[PDB]
Design a protein around this motif. Structure first.
Motif, mmCIF file in Angstrom:
data_model
loop_
_atom_site.group_PDB
_atom_site.id
_atom_site.type_symbol
_atom_site.label_atom_id
_atom_site.label_comp_id
_atom_site.label_asym_id
_atom_site.label_seq_id
_atom_site.Cartn_x
_atom_site.Cartn_y
_atom_site.Cartn_z
ATOM 1 N N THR A 94 0.848 -1.179 0.000
ATOM 2 C CA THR A 94 0.000 0.000 0.000
ATOM 3 C C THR A 94 0.883 1.228 0.000
ATOM 4 O O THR A 94 2.087 1.135 0.233
ATOM 5 N N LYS A 125 -2.056 -2.460 11.215
ATOM 6 C CA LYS A 125 -2.515 -2.861 9.896
ATOM 7 C C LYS A 125 -1.370 -2.901 8.903
ATOM 8 O O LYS A 125 -1.196 -3.889 8.192
ATOM 9 N N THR A 133 0.859 -5.618 9.902
ATOM 10 C CA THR A 133 0.082 -6.808 9.567
ATOM 11 C C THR A 133 0.146 -7.128 8.076
ATOM 12 O O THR A 133 0.552 -8.223 7.686
ATOM 13 N N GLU A 134 -0.255 -6.168 7.248
ATOM 14 C CA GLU A 134 -0.186 -6.332 5.802
ATOM 15 C C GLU A 134 1.133 -6.958 5.403
ATOM 16 O O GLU A 134 1.175 -7.999 4.750
ATOM 17 N N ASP A 165 1.854 -10.575 6.154
ATOM 18 C CA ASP A 165 1.055 -11.441 5.291
ATOM 19 C C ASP A 165 1.607 -11.553 3.872
ATOM 20 O O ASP A 165 1.613 -12.636 3.289
ATOM 21 N N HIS A 212 -25.285 0.614 -15.237
ATOM 22 C CA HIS A 212 -25.158 -0.231 -14.048
ATOM 23 C C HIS A 212 -26.191 0.068 -12.953
ATOM 24 O O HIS A 212 -25.817 0.472 -11.851
ATOM 25 N N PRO A 213 -27.490 -0.123 -13.248
ATOM 26 C CA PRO A 213 -28.502 0.028 -12.201
ATOM 27 C C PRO A 213 -28.963 -1.335 -11.695
ATOM 28 O O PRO A 213 -28.383 -1.882 -10.757
ATOM 29 N N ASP A 245 -20.801 -5.758 -8.474
ATOM 30 C CA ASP A 245 -21.241 -4.425 -8.843
ATOM 31 C C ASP A 245 -22.747 -4.310 -8.662
ATOM 32 O O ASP A 245 -23.286 -3.213 -8.500
ATOM 33 N N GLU A 250 -23.954 -2.178 -5.840
ATOM 34 C CA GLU A 250 -23.938 -0.723 -5.829
ATOM 35 C C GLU A 250 -23.255 -0.222 -4.573
ATOM 36 O O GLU A 250 -23.749 0.680 -3.895
ATOM 37 N N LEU A 274 -11.392 -7.138 7.232
ATOM 38 C CA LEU A 274 -10.878 -5.973 7.932
ATOM 39 C C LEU A 274 -9.378 -5.826 7.730
ATOM 40 O O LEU A 274 -8.822 -4.744 7.908
ATOM 41 N N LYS A 275 -8.727 -6.915 7.342
ATOM 42 C CA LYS A 275 -7.302 -6.879 7.050
ATOM 43 C C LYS A 275 -7.032 -6.132 5.757
ATOM 44 O O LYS A 275 -6.088 -5.355 5.661
ATOM 45 N N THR A 276 -7.872 -6.376 4.760
ATOM 46 C CA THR A 276 -7.716 -5.713 3.472
ATOM 47 C C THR A 276 -7.581 -4.196 3.639
ATOM 48 O O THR A 276 -8.340 -3.565 4.380
ATOM 49 N N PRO A 277 -6.586 -3.618 2.955
ATOM 50 C CA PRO A 277 -6.222 -2.203 3.014
ATOM 51 C C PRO A 277 -7.392 -1.306 2.676
ATOM 52 O O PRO A 277 -8.224 -1.668 1.853
ATOM 53 N N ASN A 278 -7.439 -0.141 3.311
ATOM 54 C CA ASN A 278 -8.454 0.868 3.031
ATOM 55 C C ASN A 278 -9.860 0.453 3.430
ATOM 56 O O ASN A 278 -10.790 1.256 3.385
ATOM 57 N N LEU A 279 -10.013 -0.808 3.818
ATOM 58 C CA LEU A 279 -11.301 -1.293 4.293
ATOM 59 C C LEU A 279 -11.363 -1.227 5.812
ATOM 60 O O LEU A 279 -10.733 -2.026 6.506
ATOM 61 N N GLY A 280 -12.129 -0.265 6.320
ATOM 62 C CA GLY A 280 -12.305 -0.097 7.751
ATOM 63 C C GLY A 280 -13.721 -0.394 8.213
ATOM 64 O O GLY A 280 -14.531 -0.937 7.449
#
Lengths: 74, 50, 53, 75
Positions: free
Chosen positions: A14, A49, A52-53, A56, C52-53, D9, D12, D41-47
């Motif tokens: 990141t 995080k 952590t990242e 992993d 995309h609806p 997708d 939405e 929650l580990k995945t980046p930018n995902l809070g």
DNA sequence: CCATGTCAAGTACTTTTTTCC
DNA sequence: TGGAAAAAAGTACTTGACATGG
């Protein structure tokens, strides 16, 4: 070894992580694996995080932190 | 001041339905009419606004 | 219909659905007090919203 | 399920959420429900919020996370 | 021409995340 | 523990350059 000499960018980390590292005279994965998990958390802006990242993504390729290396660097 | 059908058609033709602008052909198929009719309707609705 | 007031407006403007005349980006922007670029950006966004609806 | 095969997708979701997913080899809602709330929650930018949002919208359609599936995928 | 549309970035403000005490 | 406060992702809009067909 062959994957130890590559640039850290090959880790597709990141931005945060990335920036921390470049801020830290870390250019090569070899430089990296030698840094202890603890030694990292100290580095600014690098937290759970981010740490952590990194663990992993190192694991996803056989690698872990705190590794004792020889013949380093040039 | 446009009829249900008139408005529809322009949204159809102009893509205002699904972002896709539709040839006379397709809109005609939808209302079960000939491409000619569509156009004639389109144009009529266009005149109605000017 | 999941389009904002503005988004919808612009496409009727641009597509002429307002006064039978299709409006260049320039004019619509002038209307909303924005740059032509912005208008396009909004159009395309609203367009993508309907695919995309 | 018939809704399990659909693209994410169809949810939405917000941009953030979306981006994280596309960044995570997640294309199909099936791939998704199999991932645990934690694994996400580990995945980046995902809070919290992103996570939270996602749970809600899966719920709004019968779905939840960490689901165990079989015969996966169909191509 | 040359007016309109399109592209690639670029600045500046809001929301979410993420550190860190 | 929990919450202020840095940093990043996103969202609105601008700008100047380019092409291009009208």
């Amino acid at each position: 070894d062959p994957i130890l000499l590559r640039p850290v960018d090959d880790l597709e980390l990141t931005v945060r992580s990335a920036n921390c590292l470049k801020a830290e005279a870390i250019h090569y994965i070899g430089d990296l694996v030698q840094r202890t998990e603890v030694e990292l958390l100290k580095t600014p802006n690098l937290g759970k995080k981010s740490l952590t990242e990194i663990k992993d993504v190192l694991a996803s390729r056989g690698l872990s932190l705190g590794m004792r290396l020889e013949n380093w660097p040039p | 001041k446009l009829s249900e059908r008139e408005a529809m058609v322009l949204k159809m033709r102009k893509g205002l339905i699904d972002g896709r602008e539709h040839t006379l052909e397709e809109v005609g198929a939808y209302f079960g009419v000939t491409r000619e009719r569509i156009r004639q309707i389109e144009n009529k609705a266009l005149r109605k606004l000017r």
